[PDB]
Write a protein that binds this ligand. Structure first.
Ligand code: VO4
Ligand SMILES: [Mg+2]
Length: 299
């Protein structure tokens, strides 16, 4: 409720840029010394996007434990996320080692491999059932089991095997197809339909490790996805939409990874998505089918 009154006041005053710049100014600044070591240069996709030392995910190998990935641990909401960059050709084994070690069940990919003429993420999962991937460095095998291709997103079932122990795990891949970099999703409905598909899969259960969320840099689209989810969860535990302070939640998330939400329009969209999602949280179950129909996911 209060977020909705704030939304209309910011909209009618045309001050989303100023509100967003305020968040940038107030955001935490913590050291990223490991990310900046010379030996880790080729493990970072972008020179200006690094994990903080205090929240970085450490790989369980004595050689080099570095991956560009951050644990966003939302204490009040009681949910954690791992936000990471799109893996590079040389860090795909590290990525799946992280998924294994952290016991994640879901990977949310919000970008395409090719965007705007450039390669934004390595092809880190197999595209054909009969062409499985072996990651020699980390001793992992990855097989495509099936995929469900909808109009704007795809859900894949993957099998991840630890070749040292022969244990296997099902990993769900939720792949958003039409959310461009530095933009907001096309509609709250299509975004919320996707978010609730991730939720319904069980991938966010506290019984599993944290869901892995990435785009190319792991901060813009990834931050928008996690901000909306966390705000809806906070509202859900209290059953009180007016108790959620979305800018405070975003500043809390930014204690764990720099730069989350990259444009003023992504911040504005986050308000829109949380305000709409609140209808479901507060007991209008029918609204979820409305999002699905407006999503045209079968067209
Ligand atoms: O590739 V993302 O720019 O949305 O951090
Ligand atoms: Mg507010």
């Amino acid at each position: 409720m209060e977020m909705e009154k704030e939304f209309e006041q910011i909209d009618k005053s045309g001050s989303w840029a100023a509100i967003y710049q305020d968040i940038r100014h107030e955001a935490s600044d913590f050291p990223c010394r490991v990310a900046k070591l010379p030996k880790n240069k080729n493990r970072n996709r972008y020179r200006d996007v690094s994990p903080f030392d205090h929240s970085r995910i450490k790989l369980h190998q004595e050689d080099n434990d570095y991956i560009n990935a951050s644990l966003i641990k939302m204490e009040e909401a009681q949910r954690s996320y791992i936000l990471t960059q799109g893996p590079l050709p040389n860090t795909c084994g590290h990525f799946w080692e992280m998924v294994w070690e952290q016991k994640s069940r879901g990977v949310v990919m919000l970008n395409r491999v090719m965007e705007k003429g450039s390669l934004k993420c390595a092809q880190y999962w197999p595209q054909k059932e009969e062409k499985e991937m072996i990651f020699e460095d980390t001793n992992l095998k990855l097989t495509l089991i099936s995929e469900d291709i909808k109009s704007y997103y795809t859900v894949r079932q993957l099998e991840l095997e630890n070749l040292t122990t022969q244990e296997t795990r099902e990993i769900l891949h939720f792949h958003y197809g039409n959310w461009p970099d530095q933009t907001a999703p096309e509609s709250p409905a299509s975004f919320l339909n996707f978010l609730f598909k991730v939720r319904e899969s069980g991938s966010l259960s506290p019984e599993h490790g944290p869901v892995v969320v990435h785009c190319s840099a792991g901060i813009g689209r990834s931050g928008t996805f996690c901000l909306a989810d966390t705000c809806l969860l906070l509202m859900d535990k209290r059953k009180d939409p007016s108790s959620v302070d979305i800018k405070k939640v975003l500043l809390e998330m930014r204690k764990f990874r720099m730069g989350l939400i990259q444009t003023a329009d992504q911040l504005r969209f986050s308000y829109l998505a949380v305000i709409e999602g609140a209808k479901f949280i507060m007991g209008d179950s029918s609204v979820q089918d409305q999002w699905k129909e407006l999503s045209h996911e079968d067209l």
